[PDB]
Design a binder for these strands. Structure first.
Lengths: 103, 95
DNA sequence: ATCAGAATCCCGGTGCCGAGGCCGCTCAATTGGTCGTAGACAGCTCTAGCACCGCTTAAACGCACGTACGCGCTGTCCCCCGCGTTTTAACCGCCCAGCTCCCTGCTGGCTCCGAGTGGGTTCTGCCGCTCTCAATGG
DNA sequence: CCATTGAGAGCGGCGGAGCCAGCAGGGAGCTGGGCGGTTAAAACGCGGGGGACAGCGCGTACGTGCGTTTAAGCGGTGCTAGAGCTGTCTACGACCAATTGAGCGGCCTCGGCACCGGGATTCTGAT
């Protein structure tokens, strides 16, 4: 493969195909399917990280959409990135405005 | 019975790399796959304009790189460039 | 606070269906390889970006004053709240329809095609490779 | 008496008309999906509390004006850095073909977790 040759889990082949076929440019370098597959791999790790955490915190062995949402909205940097994305079955973070609380 | 692709199995392998004793639902699996494709477009897209902007025909790891720096928030970008520059050099090692 | 009193949480039992795993096939990836061109890189020129100055003055700053708006208070009246009853929209049992069971219709295959009679002429596989005989060479 | 071998001869091959059979193509059975019955979310009833909103008044901050003060804008001159245009060589990518397992659908069993009925707690409102 090449996932091997770059220590990646993410299909370095698949990616090289998709760049060429998805009409981004005439020609496509050798490093880029690797650079990108990596960045894709990197980021899917950070999510899987904090969601899993969240599934532990929420006492489950399996990650459901909520755990993703919690991971995402609680992370300041990830939340920005997915600033315009609604995640199916995410729900919302619990947040109740002060002045609404009892006295 | 059509052979529809995804990133499912690799998402999993990476899941094991980070949370070995943890699993995932199909519903969340879709979200991970959606996430991957969305991010792939956004980076690929930026890269594409980058090339054009600079009257050049090739999307190299460099184009991808700077694409990443426009697409990602300070810290997440930072690590991304790492893993990016790393796996590339490690790739150009082997042959 | 101090009370009971809800409503909510956490817990142990049970249960079922989607996770996560393996079976094996196939098609996308990888390999080895050629060809040419995009773009790297070194050379060169020529724009406009930076710098720096002083004459001019329009803009900015700083303060004085009071006006009219921010907001804090009150006071009233009613619009939504929570608790509850009845109507309606959603979940379980029956009846009707799609997946299914039956007939209807074209085409290929098979059989038959008058009795009798006379005469005629043509047609019973053909080559060739081994075993045997007894003629005839020494 | 001895003897290779031509010749003899024999076997292994080299038209036309009319019934039934087969098939393929189009409706309405019994298991799935759409309507009736039951039953849970919604519309309505009831009535009281607190929030909206309007009025008022106080206190003060922000608009206005003027005199003082600061530096923007002007155009004018000088300097070279860097962009943009140029010119050669070649590395890296696309493209073609042939071989190989990574990845997908299809498969079954199994356990993480939805379900709940009981007992543990953590508040809310009344007092």
């Amino acid at each position: 493969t090449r996932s091997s040759r770059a220590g990646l889990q993410f299909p370095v082949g698949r990616v090289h195909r998709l760049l060429r076929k998805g009409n981004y440019a005439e020609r496509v370098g050798a490093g880029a399917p690797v650079y990108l597959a990596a960045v894709l791999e990197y980021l899917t790790a950070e999510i899987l990280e904090l969601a899993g955490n969240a599934a532990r915190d929420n006492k489950k062995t399996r990650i459901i959409p909520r755990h993703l949402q919690l991971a995402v909205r609680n992370d300041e940097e990830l939340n920005k990135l997915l600033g315009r994305v609604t995640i199916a079955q995410g729900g919302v973070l619990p947040n109740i405005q002060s002045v609404l609380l009892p006295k | 019975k059509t052979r529809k692709e995804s990133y499912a199995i690799y998402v999993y392998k990476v899941l094991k790399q980070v949370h070995p004793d943890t699993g995932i639902s199909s519903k969340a699996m879709s979200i991970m796959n959606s996430f991957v494709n969305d991010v792939f477009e956004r980076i690929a897209g930026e890269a594409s304009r980058l090339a054009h902007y600079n009257k050049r025909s090739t999307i190299t790891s460099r184009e991808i790189q700077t694409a990443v720096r426009l697409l990602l928030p300070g810290e997440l970008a930072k690590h991304a460039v790492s893993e990016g520059t790393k796996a590339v050099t490690k790739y150009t090692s082997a042959k």
